[PDB]
Nucleic acid binder design. Structure first.
Ligand code: MG
Ligand code: MG
Ligand code: MG
Ligand code: MG
Ligand code: MG
Ligand code: MG
Ligand code: MG
Ligand code: MG
Ligand code: MG
Ligand code: MG
Ligand code: MG
Ligand code: MG
Ligand code: MG
Ligand code: MG
Ligand code: MG
Ligand code: MG
Ligand code: MG
Ligand code: MG
Ligand code: MG
Ligand code: MG
Ligand code: MG
Ligand code: MG
Ligand code: MG
Ligand code: MG
Ligand code: MG
Ligand code: MG
Ligand code: MG
Ligand code: MG
Ligand code: MG
Ligand code: MG
Ligand code: MG
Ligand code: MG
Ligand code: MG
Ligand code: MG
Ligand code: MG
Ligand code: MG
Ligand code: MG
Ligand code: MG
Ligand code: MG
Ligand code: MG
Ligand code: MG
Ligand code: MG
Ligand code: MG
Ligand code: MG
Ligand code: MG
Ligand code: MG
Ligand code: MG
Ligand code: MG
Ligand code: MG
Ligand code: MG
Ligand code: MG
Ligand code: MG
Ligand code: MG
Ligand code: MG
Ligand code: MG
Ligand code: MG
Ligand code: MG
Ligand code: MG
Ligand code: MG
Ligand code: MG
Ligand code: MG
Ligand code: MG
Ligand code: MG
Ligand code: MG
Ligand code: MG
Ligand code: MG
Ligand code: MG
Ligand code: MG
Ligand code: MG
Ligand code: MG
Ligand code: MG
Ligand code: MG
Ligand code: MG
Ligand code: MG
Ligand code: MG
Ligand code: MG
Ligand code: MG
Ligand code: MG
Ligand code: ZN
Ligand code: ZN
Lengths: 53, 69, 110, 181, 141, 123, 154
RNA sequence: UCCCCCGUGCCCAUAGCGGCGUGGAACCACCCGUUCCCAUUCCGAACACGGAAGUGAAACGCGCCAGCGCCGAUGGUACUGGGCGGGCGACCGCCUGGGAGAGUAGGUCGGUGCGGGGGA
RNA sequence: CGCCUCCUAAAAGGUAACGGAGGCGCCCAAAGGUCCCCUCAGGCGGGACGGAAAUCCGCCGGAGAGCGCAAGGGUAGAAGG
RNA sequence: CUGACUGGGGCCUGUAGAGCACUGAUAGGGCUAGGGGGCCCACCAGCCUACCAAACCCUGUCAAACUCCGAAGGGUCCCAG
């Protein structure tokens, strides 16, 4: 990690729990990350959005 | 061939100044040209045009043998 | 010096062999199509089928589907059920694909 | 396939003569055209006017075939070149479209060349293929002064089944390639 | 005097002097040679001293072959320092020479001239040496 | 490339337009149009392709032009150098050939001034 | 040529023992045979110093055979500069590659040649800063083959 | 069982490179086409489909040849486990058991398993 | 002064000195998953601008290229494109 | 009864030695792109080079961080004393 390469949380769009930690380069990828991910609460795959860590 | 990206080749007739006519295929239906194989100096015999000169010089000069003997 | 043909043949076959299933290999000539189910551990062929042996002629694809059915018929009879399809240098398409369809149609599992 | 004047000439006039000149024993032993490859070296479009679809479209007009792009294999400081930059157009002509292009080339294009006095006898591959370079693209019949932004030249590869220079020369000569010596 | 034009590594560990020479044990070029009887690190300045001795005896005549090359860096700490603090600086170059090695050969000169020259050369070396003549044994290798 | 190897400018008169060809001065322009019977005052845009080829055919066959003329001019200069007369020597060093002074001027042949230090004066 | 030299057979006699008693251990072989032999050192030394690998040496075996050989290999002792081992190559009718001396009428004392044993020469003449010749141009007395590359510099 | 071809393995150059020669009935390839499925950062080149007039030219298969490559003894030596001596040292020697590499002789222009098609 | 690579290290592992040499404190949303396809550097020859080196063609070329960064190992029957 | 040690057998290894196929070092000679220098010449190219210049070949060598090779031994498992 660094200033350009930040740490981030992935929040399930449906039930709103954060389920995943990961990183991105906010210069290369300034958009909030959106990834389909299995949500343990919803028990199904859901679009997850980047959230501030 | 791939659809959409290529230009159609159609029957076409290319016409030269020397009255030559060429039956071929092109993107354009009819095309008019200043020169062709049939009339180009290098192609036709040796049609040496204006220059028969070779080159002449120097002692084609002559004119004459007048300076005395 | 290897050809793209051989590399492709080596590549898909190597991947196939690792699973350890019996190998349904398929050869496709300009005229004909051949299939033999192979035990790579014993290096032995258990069952075979081909357009040439069955003396079929016609639509190459339709012929392919038939030799596929033929292979399966002899196959289940020998107790053979599961298999891994080896397309080798060929795309999974057309004649090769029709043969695979015939083998499946016949009751082969893959 | 279709009838093209140069193609027919190859089969009825050129093929018998070649057997006469060289005495092949097999109908495949005798020289053939394999393909013609055209290349616009370009790279004038490396940075400035970073896309010249103009050269592609005009090349598409001449051949009837849309060229594919070629990108830099490596970065080169001196050429102001970054690896992967679009710096060329190449189109591969085979079969009818090869004949048609060669036909107009020999009949009208080469004669249009400035101060043209025949091709270079020495430009043979050594392996029975030939290459020639053009500096203007207006030399072709279906390209005119009105439609052009700037002069672009090209490289032309004519590839034959002939093993040797001697066989390939006779073929190209018999087909109508005009050589200076 | 002789030394490697460039090197992959600046310093080498000292290592050993066991055994007879690996090779170079037969006359290769000239007629007469000088062969080592004892193992040593022969220095660049030693090699050059022997060569120039030979050169002077010939009055620039004849041909001299040098069949050893000093490619081993010789390291030494500066004077009056203590042990440790890294390896010393490279101060010269040596050639590892084991018994049987033909160090020098001469040719195009009389037998009397070669013998004496090779004798004077031997006196510049820190080892016992022998003078040899080319043999069928040499030419057979 | 309309004629000869060059594209003479449309929207100007033929007699003028022909001059843009290397090897045709105004004099050969007037004579070519007369000999082929085309109006000297007609804009290039407004010529029948019949007029075009007639004018074209004449001009190329009557005189040597463009590249060929340049080549023939080149051979002449080359000849002078190789023999090599004083005239040929002048072409070697790129000085005037026709007896002009070189203490001054001659800039057209010599090119831009390569200024150089002069002679200093006392104090 | 030619030279003759007494030879004897050995089996399990130690090489060190043989050499300590003045004998040179050796082997003689060809396509058909291979035998463990030894020769007297001082005698061998007399012959080899003239025969070398250029001229034929005939081994008078104890069993009465008189076999035609070429010396193919002589292993030296690097420390003492003395021969440790000899390889006698038994000649037969088939062509052999060998080294044949050169007489200048020099980077090469001799030259490598594939010649029939019946036809083995003893001389090859070469007619004579920094000009030189390349083996290709050589004399080549009948039944003889250049066994190098004609590029090779003499 | 034996010969040929087609698949597919195994040994991993004694199988390779080159130079010759040979084969189309069958098989295979090239080939004939590009309607159809599918395809080309362009190209029916490739991938693919429909074919069967032609040629074994290319490819492939099969033979020959040792120029190269590859393999490679026997003998001898280096080194050495273990046991002993010598030298001020650098280092050297003996006993017993093991034993290279290089090079020499030489060898190789493959061997073999299973299935299919054809032939005797 | 912690970590990585090679050597030292005495052919298992491990093995020291203020011994001989380098590198890390990052990075990538594609530089990750999978499917399909493709094969390098270099050398000679050929080709407008065009060069030692841009892109194009042919022949040779088993890996000497490439795999973000040190080094080593691995690797085209791909981990490379 | 498994132990140290020992017999047999399998597998793992890259040292001693050697070698030069890789990475580098390297002596003499040949053949050779860029020339140094050269009498010429520049109008435009040529020829020698008792010298410094890749690759290639021949002869001959060197290496802890080179290996096409490669021991004795060593390690480990099994059976046995
Ligand atoms: Mg996480
Ligand atoms: Mg990321
Ligand atoms: Mg998930
Ligand atoms: Mg929970
Ligand atoms: Mg965030
Ligand atoms: Mg079409
Ligand atoms: Mg049917
Ligand atoms: Mg079928
Ligand atoms: Mg298959
Ligand atoms: Mg015929
Ligand atoms: Mg040529
Ligand atoms: Mg060709
Ligand atoms: Mg035009
Ligand atoms: Mg030490
Ligand atoms: Mg000292
Ligand atoms: Mg020291
Ligand atoms: Mg220290
Ligand atoms: Mg020191
Ligand atoms: Mg030594
Ligand atoms: Mg001394
Ligand atoms: Mg003496
Ligand atoms: Mg004018
Ligand atoms: Mg004046
Ligand atoms: Mg006697
Ligand atoms: Mg001796
Ligand atoms: Mg003696
Ligand atoms: Mg020999
Ligand atoms: Mg086969
Ligand atoms: Mg098997
Ligand atoms: Mg053949
Ligand atoms: Mg034939
Ligand atoms: Mg063949
Ligand atoms: Mg047939
Ligand atoms: Mg037939
Ligand atoms: Mg269609
Ligand atoms: Mg053939
Ligand atoms: Mg051989
Ligand atoms: Mg050969
Ligand atoms: Mg060997
Ligand atoms: Mg042995
Ligand atoms: Mg021992
Ligand atoms: Mg001991
Ligand atoms: Mg022993
Ligand atoms: Mg022993
Ligand atoms: Mg033994
Ligand atoms: Mg051996
Ligand atoms: Mg040796
Ligand atoms: Mg031997
Ligand atoms: Mg044989
Ligand atoms: Mg072979
Ligand atoms: Mg086989
Ligand atoms: Mg055979
Ligand atoms: Mg087989
Ligand atoms: Mg069989
Ligand atoms: Mg059968
Ligand atoms: Mg049968
Ligand atoms: Mg270790
Ligand atoms: Mg452990
Ligand atoms: Mg990556
Ligand atoms: Mg992907
Ligand atoms: Mg080139
Ligand atoms: Mg340009
Ligand atoms: Mg690499
Ligand atoms: Mg770095
Ligand atoms: Mg017990
Ligand atoms: Mg135990
Ligand atoms: Mg034990
Ligand atoms: Mg033990
Ligand atoms: Mg060693
Ligand atoms: Mg080396
Ligand atoms: Mg060494
Ligand atoms: Mg050493
Ligand atoms: Mg080592
Ligand atoms: Mg070996
Ligand atoms: Mg150990
Ligand atoms: Mg053990
Ligand atoms: Mg064991
Ligand atoms: Mg027990
Ligand atoms: Zn949820
Ligand atoms: Zn015309």
């Amino acid at each position: 990690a660094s200033e350009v390469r930040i740490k981030l949380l992935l929040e399930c769009t449906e039930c709103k729990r954060r389920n995943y930690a990961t990183e991105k380069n906010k210069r290369n990828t300034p958009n909030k990350l959106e990834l389909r991910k299995y949500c343990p609460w919803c028990r199904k795959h859901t679009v997850h959005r980047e959230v501030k860590i | 061939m791939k659809e959409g990206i290529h230009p159609k080749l159609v029957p076409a007739r290319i016409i030269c100044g020397c009255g030559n006519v060429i039956e071929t295929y092109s993107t354009k239906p009819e095309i008019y040209v200043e020169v062709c194989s049939k009339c180009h100096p290098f192609y036709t015999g040796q049609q040496r045009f204006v220059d028969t000169e070779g080159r002449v010089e120097r002692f084609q000069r002559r004119y004459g043998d007048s300076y005395r003997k | 010096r290897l050809t793209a043909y051989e590399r492709r043949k080596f590549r898909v076959r190597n991947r196939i062999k690792r699973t350890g299933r019996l190998r349904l290999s398929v050869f496709r000539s300009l005229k004909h199509i051949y299939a033999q189910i192979i035990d790579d551990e014993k290096g032995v062929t258990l069952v075979s089928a081909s357009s040439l042996a069955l003396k079929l002629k016609g639509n190459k694809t339709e012929v392919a589907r038939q030799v596929g059915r033929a292979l399966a018929e002899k196959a289940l009879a020998l107790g053979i059920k599961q298999v891994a399809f080896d397309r080798g240098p060929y795309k999974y398409h057309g004649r090769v694909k029709a043969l695979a369809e015939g083998a499946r149609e016949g009751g082969l599992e893959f | 396939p279709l009838d093209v004047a140069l193609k027919r000439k190859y089969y009825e006039e050129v093929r018998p003569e070649l057997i006469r000149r060289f005495g092949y024993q097999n109908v495949w032993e005798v020289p053939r055209l394999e393909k013609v490859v055209i290349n616009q070296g370009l790279g004038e479009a490396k940075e400035d006017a970073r896309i010249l679809e103009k050269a592609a479209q005009e090349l598409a007009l001449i051949t009837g075939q849309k060229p594919a792009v070629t990108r830099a294999k490596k970065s080169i400081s001196n050429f102001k070149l970054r690896k992967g930059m679009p710096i060329g157009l190449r189109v591969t002509l085979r079969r009818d479209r090869m004949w048609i292009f060669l036909e107009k080339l020999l009949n009208v294009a080469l004669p249009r060349i400035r101060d043209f006095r025949g091709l270079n006898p020495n430009s043979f591959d050594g392996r029975g293929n030939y290459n020639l370079g053009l500096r203007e693209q207006l030399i072709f019949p279906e390209i005119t002064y009105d439609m052009v932004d700037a002069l672009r030249g090209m490289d032309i590869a004519v590839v034959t089944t002939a093993e040797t220079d001697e066989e390939a020369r006779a073929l190209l000569e018999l087909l109508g390639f005009p050589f200076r010596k | 005097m002789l030394m490697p034009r460039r090197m992959k590594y600046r310093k080498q560990q000292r290592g050993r002097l066991k055994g007879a020479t690996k090779g170079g044990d037969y006359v290769a070029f000239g007629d007469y040679g000088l062969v080592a009887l004892e193992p040593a690190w022969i220095t660049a300045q030693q090699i050059e001293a022997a060569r120039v001795a030979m050169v002077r005896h010939f009055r620039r005549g004849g041909k001299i072959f040098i069949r050893i090359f000093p490619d081993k860096p010789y390291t030494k700490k500066p004077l009056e320092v203590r042990m440790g603090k890294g390896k010393g600086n490279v101060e010269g170059y040596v050639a590892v020479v084991k018994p049987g090695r033909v160090m020098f050969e001469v040719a195009g000169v009389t037998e009397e001239q070669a013998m004496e020259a090779l004798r004077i050369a031997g006196h510049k070396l820190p080892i016992k040496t022998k003078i040899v003549r080319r043999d069928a044994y040499d030419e057979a290798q | 490339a309309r004629i000869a190897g060059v594209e003479i400018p449309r929207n100007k008169r033929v007699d003028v337009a022909l001059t843009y060809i290397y090897g045709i001065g105004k004099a050969r322009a007037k004579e070519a149009l007369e000999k082929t019977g085309i109006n000297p005052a007609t804009r290039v845009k407004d010529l029948t392709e019949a007029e075009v080829v007639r004018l074209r055919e004449y001009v190329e066959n009557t005189w040597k032009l463009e590249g060929e003329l340049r080549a023939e001019v080149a051979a002449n200069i080359k000849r002078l150098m190789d023999i090599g007369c004083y005239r040929g020597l002048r072409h070697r060093r790129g000085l005037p050939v026709r007896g002009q002074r070189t203490r001054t001027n001659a800039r057209t042949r010599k090119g831009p001034r390569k200024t150089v230090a002069g002679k200093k004066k006392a104090p | 040529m030619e030279y003759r030299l007494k030879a004897y057979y050995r089996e399990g006699e130690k090489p060190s023992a043989l050499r300590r008693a003045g004998k040179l251990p050796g082997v003689m072989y060809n396509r058909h045979l291979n035998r463990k032999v030894y020769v007297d050192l001082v005698e061998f030394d007399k012959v080899f110093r003239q025969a070398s690998i250029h001229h034929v040496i005939v081994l008078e075996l104890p069993d009465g055979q008189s076999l035609p050989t070429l010396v193919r290999q002589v292993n030296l002792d690097k420390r003492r500069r003395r021969p440790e081992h000899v390889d006698f190559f038994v000649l037969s009718d088939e062509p052999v590659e060998m080294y044949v001396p050169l007489r200048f009428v020099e980077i090469h004392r001799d030259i490598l040649v594939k010649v029939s044993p019946r036809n083995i020469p003893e001389f090859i003449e070469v007619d004579v800063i920094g000009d030189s010749l390349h083996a290709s141009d050589l004399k080549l007395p009948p039944g003889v083959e250049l066994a190098v590359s004609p590029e090779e510099t003499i």
